[PDB]
Enzyme design. Structure first.
Site, short mmCIF file in Angstrom:
data_model
loop_
_atom_site.label_atom_id
_atom_site.label_comp_id
_atom_site.label_asym_id
_atom_site.label_seq_id
_atom_site.Cartn_x
_atom_site.Cartn_y
_atom_site.Cartn_z
N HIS A 1 0.84 -1.19 0.00
CA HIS A 1 0.00 0.00 0.00
C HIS A 1 0.88 1.25 0.00
O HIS A 1 1.39 1.66 1.04
CB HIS A 1 -0.99 -0.03 1.17
CG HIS A 1 -2.36 -0.53 0.80
ND1 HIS A 1 -2.92 -0.34 -0.46
CD2 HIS A 1 -3.29 -1.20 1.53
CE1 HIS A 1 -4.12 -0.88 -0.47
NE2 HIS A 1 -4.36 -1.42 0.76
N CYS B 1 -3.37 5.25 -3.86
CA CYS B 1 -2.54 4.07 -3.97
C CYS B 1 -1.79 4.13 -5.31
O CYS B 1 -2.41 4.29 -6.36
CB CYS B 1 -3.36 2.78 -3.84
SG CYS B 1 -2.70 1.57 -2.64
N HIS C 1 -2.63 1.22 -7.10
CA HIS C 1 -4.07 1.27 -7.28
C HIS C 1 -4.51 2.72 -7.45
O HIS C 1 -5.49 3.15 -6.84
CB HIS C 1 -4.78 0.55 -6.14
CG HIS C 1 -3.97 -0.54 -5.49
ND1 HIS C 1 -3.87 -0.69 -4.12
CD2 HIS C 1 -3.22 -1.54 -6.04
CE1 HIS C 1 -3.09 -1.73 -3.87
NE2 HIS C 1 -2.69 -2.26 -5.06
N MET D 1 -9.20 3.65 -4.64
CA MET D 1 -8.57 3.84 -3.35
C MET D 1 -7.80 5.16 -3.30
O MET D 1 -6.67 5.24 -3.80
CB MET D 1 -7.61 2.68 -3.08
CG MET D 1 -7.75 2.18 -1.64
SD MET D 1 -6.23 1.39 -1.12
CE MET D 1 -6.29 1.73 0.63
CU LIG Z 1 -3.98 -0.03 -2.14
#
Ligand SMILES: [Cu+2]
Length: 98
Positions: free
Chosen positions: A39, A83, A86, A91
């Site tokens: 993350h 992210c 991501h 997110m």
């Molecule tokens: Cu993430």
């Protein structure tokens, strides 16, 4: 005041809560590792300065459950960190300094 955001959720969902946090202008913020790793946390200058969101940005990652990051909310603006892996899934987070 001191804010705290988790790069996920205490369950099993990749989300950013609190999606929005409001603290004073000069305080810091700590993050926490979650699931759905890694993350990353990159603060794309979205209303704020670059260099500013730079130090606030984290071009790193998260693998070990226990590591956390820090960000200075000195400059009053709006930082948006999402992210990296991501950055186009669903997110992201919003920041507000006062
Ligand atoms: Cu993430």
């Amino acid at each position: 005041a001191n804010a705290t955001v988790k790069m996920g959720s205490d369950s099993g969902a990749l989300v950013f809560e609190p999606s929005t946090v409001t603290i004073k202008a000069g305080e810091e913020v700590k993050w926490v590792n979650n699931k759905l790793s890694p993350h990353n946390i990159v603060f794309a200058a979205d209303g704020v300065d670059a260099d500013t969101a730079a130090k606030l940005s984290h071009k790193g990652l998260a693998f070990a459950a226990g590591e956390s990051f820090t960000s200075t909310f000195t400059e009053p603006g709006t930082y948006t960190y999402y992210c990296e892996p991501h950055r186009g899934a669903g997110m992201v987070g919003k920041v507000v300094v006062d």
